[PDB]
């Protein structure tokens, strides 16, 4: 209910890190794609569990819960990736043992473009010195911004209200608080662009028959 209690609820709700081993042999198209999609499929399970722990989410219409998650999952995955990658310049921390540079991008036609976007947006978050409690609010905002309609508005305002509270505890001026909030939210459209390009990439790789049978990922992809 309180902004601090909402932030403490999100903190506790953070997924555990999914463990994926780097392939033994240097990356091929197939091994990189198997590595990234195995990770996504496993993270998608944890994402669904995280969503159900956002206060009020499970009070939405089942059909709203499904639409929010089908719409936002790749943006939510990417925001997590950027956060994991923020303490490690030059690198994408997909998982503890899955640490990729622009280099390993080479192994899959078109992936380097996606890595560049992710690396650049990650740099913006790093320059802004994104804070843990800010990240938590922004990741929930990405989901919720992607009678049930009135509840969703209310749930999005509660999370927005929490992000406003987290920036206030920084103690900067009222004008600087506004600018920081604007600067964070304007980065959301860039996360979403990286999401659109990554989704189009993944759908094309599914067409090439390079993607494995991971039932949840396939389902989420076919929602587009």
């Amino acid at each position: 209910l309180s902004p601090e209690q909402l932030v403490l609820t999100l903190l506790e709700a953070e997924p555990p890190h999914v463990l994926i081993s780097r392939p033994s042999a240097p990356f091929t198209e197939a091994s990189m794609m198997m590595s990234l999609t195995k990770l996504a499929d496993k993270e998608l399970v944890h994402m669904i569990s995280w969503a159900k722990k956002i206060p009020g989410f499970v009070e939405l219409s089942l059909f709203d819960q499904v639409r929010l998650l089908e719409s936002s999952w790749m943006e939510v995955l990417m925001m997590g990736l950027m956060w994991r990658s923020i303490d490690h310049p030059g690198k994408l921390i997909f998982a503890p043992d899955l640490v990729l540079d622009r280099d390993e991008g080479k192994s899959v036609e078109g992936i380097l473009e996606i890595f560049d976007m992710l690396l650049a947006t990650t740099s913006r978050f790093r320059e802004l010195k994104l804070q843990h409690k800010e990240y938590l609010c922004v990741k929930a905002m990405i989901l919720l911004n992607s009678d049930s309609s009135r509840k969703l508005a209310h749930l999005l305002n509660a999370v927005t209200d929490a992000l406003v509270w987290v920036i206030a505890k920084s103690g900067i001026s009222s004008q600087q608080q506004s600018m920081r909030l604007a600067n964070l939210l304007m980065l959301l459209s860039h996360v979403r662009h990286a999401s659109n390009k990554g989704m189009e990439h993944l759908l094309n790789m599914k067409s090439k028959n390079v993607v494995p049978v991971y039932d949840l990922l396939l389902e989420m992809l076919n929602a587009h």
């Binding site: 669904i48 569990s49 089942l62 819960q65 499904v66 998650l69 089908e70 949840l216």
Partner: peptide, 10 residues
Amino acid sequence: HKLVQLLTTT
């Protein structure tokens, strides 16, 4: 189907 299962029966 799997999304609905994870949302409602997990």
